[PDB]
Amino acid sequence: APQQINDIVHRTITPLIEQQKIPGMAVAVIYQGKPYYFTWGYADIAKKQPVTQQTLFELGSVSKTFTGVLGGDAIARGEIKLSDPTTKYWPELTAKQWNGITLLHLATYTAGGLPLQVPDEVKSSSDLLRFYQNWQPAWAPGTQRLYANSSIGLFGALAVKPSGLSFEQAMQTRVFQPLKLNHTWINVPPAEEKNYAWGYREGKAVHVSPGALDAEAYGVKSTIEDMARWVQSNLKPLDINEKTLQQGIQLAQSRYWQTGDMYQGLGWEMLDWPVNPDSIIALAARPVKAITPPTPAVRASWVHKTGATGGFGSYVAFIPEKELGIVMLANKNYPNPARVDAAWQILNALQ
Ligand SMILES: *C(=O)[C@H]([C@@H](C)O)[C@H]1CC(SCCNC=N)=C(C(=O)O)N1
Structure with a gap:
C-alpha cells in the first residue's frame, strides 16, 4: 500500500463516510494492475461485526455489468446475436409492438420506454409474459x-x-x-451468511427483497476482493484464457449509442478520457444517436457503473489506458454525485 495511495484514499473516504453517515465501507484501488484494499466501520452494527475484505455487499445495479458480460459471452459463443429480434427467443411475445425490438435494444435500454422496475405484482413467469405483452412503448425502438x-x-x-x-x-x-x-453470488449460500453485510435504510438493517428478473438487474452480492478482480478482468480482458469470455468482456465495452458525452455498452457506461468530473432523477428520457457500427472498446475511456439497493450504494470505474480502477462498496445508499466525486478525486490523483 504505497503511501500515496493510502493518502489519497483515506483523505477522500474519511470525510465521505462522515458527511454521508455510512456505517461500513470497503474500497479497492487497482493501480498499475495491482489491488489495494481499505475497509472502515461495520458490516453489522448490532452484532459489532466489522467490514473486512471478505464482507459481502449488495452490488445493486452494478450487477448489470455481469449480465452484460454474460450476454457478451453468449454472443461470442454464437448462441445469440444482438441483431436478433426479441421474439426469436420468446415466441410467446406475439404483441405487435415487439416487431423490430432486438436484443440490442433490450440490453441498452432503447426498446422504446420499458419501465425502470418490473411491477411487484409480477411473480410468476405468467405474469411476466403478460407484463411484456401489455407494455405499450412510448417511442419507436432505438430512438x-x-x-x-x-x-x-x-x-x-x-x-x-x-x-x-x-x-x-x-x-x-x-x-x-x-x-x-x-x-460472488446471485443467492448467498448459508455458509457465507456470516459475511453478508446488512444494509441500512433510515437506521434499519435491511437486505434486498426478491423480485422478478432481480438476478439479471440488481441481484449480485460480492466482496471487495472479488470486485477488484472483476475490475482487473475488465481492465485487461486479454489475460483471460476462456476465449468466449475474453470476447464477451470486449463486447460489453463497445460503444453502441451516444447520449451527450456518454456511450452505452452492455451494462458498462463509458465516457472518453480525460473526463471533467461535473460531466460524469427518477426518470430521465434521453434521445440517443446510434453508433453504426459499434466502436470497439476504447482504451482511453472512463468506464463505470453505479448501483444501489434500498440499503447499499456502490460504484465501480476504471481507465483501461492507465491500468487504473476503483471499487467503492457501502452498506448505505448515499447520493450518486458523492460516489463519483470521490472516485474521480482518487483516480485523478493517481492518474
Ligand atoms: C439499479 O439499477 C438501482 C435500481 C433501479 O434497481 C438504482 C436505484 C438507485 S437509487 C433510487 C432511489 N432510491 C432512494 N433511496 C440507484 C443509484 O445507484 O443511485 N440505482
Whole structure:
C-alpha cells in the first residue's frame, strides 16, 4: 500500500463516510494492475461485526455489468446475436409492438420506454409474459434511452435460453468460476451468511427483497476482493484464457449509442478520457444517436457503473489506458454525485 495511495484514499473516504453517515465501507484501488484494499466501520452494527475484505455487499445495479458480460459471452459463443429480434427467443411475445425490438435494444435500454422496475405484482413467469405483452412503448425502438431494469433484465433472461442453463448456472459457470470470483453470488449460500453485510435504510438493517428478473438487474452480492478482480478482468480482458469470455468482456465495452458525452455498452457506461468530473432523477428520457457500427472498446475511456439497493450504494470505474480502477462498496445508499466525486478525486490523483 504505497503511501500515496493510502493518502489519497483515506483523505477522500474519511470525510465521505462522515458527511454521508455510512456505517461500513470497503474500497479497492487497482493501480498499475495491482489491488489495494481499505475497509472502515461495520458490516453489522448490532452484532459489532466489522467490514473486512471478505464482507459481502449488495452490488445493486452494478450487477448489470455481469449480465452484460454474460450476454457478451453468449454472443461470442454464437448462441445469440444482438441483431436478433426479441421474439426469436420468446415466441410467446406475439404483441405487435415487439416487431423490430432486438436484443440490442433490450440490453441498452432503447426498446422504446420499458419501465425502470418490473411491477411487484409480477411473480410468476405468467405474469411476466403478460407484463411484456401489455407494455405499450412510448417511442419507436432505438430512438431514446430510459435506464430500465425490465429492459436489461429481459435481455439477461433471454440471452441464456439457448444454453439451457438457468441464468444463475450460466453466470456461475461462464463468468464467476473462470474468473475465480469464488465469493460472488446471485443467492448467498448459508455458509457465507456470516459475511453478508446488512444494509441500512433510515437506521434499519435491511437486505434486498426478491423480485422478478432481480438476478439479471440488481441481484449480485460480492466482496471487495472479488470486485477488484472483476475490475482487473475488465481492465485487461486479454489475460483471460476462456476465449468466449475474453470476447464477451470486449463486447460489453463497445460503444453502441451516444447520449451527450456518454456511450452505452452492455451494462458498462463509458465516457472518453480525460473526463471533467461535473460531466460524469427518477426518470430521465434521453434521445440517443446510434453508433453504426459499434466502436470497439476504447482504451482511453472512463468506464463505470453505479448501483444501489434500498440499503447499499456502490460504484465501480476504471481507465483501461492507465491500468487504473476503483471499487467503492457501502452498506448505505448515499447520493450518486458523492460516489463519483470521490472516485474521480482518487483516480485523478493517481492518474
Ligand atoms: C439499479 O439499477 C438501482 C435500481 C433501479 O434497481 C438504482 C436505484 C438507485 S437509487 C433510487 C432511489 N432510491 C432512494 N433511496 C440507484 C443509484 O445507484 O443511485 N440505482
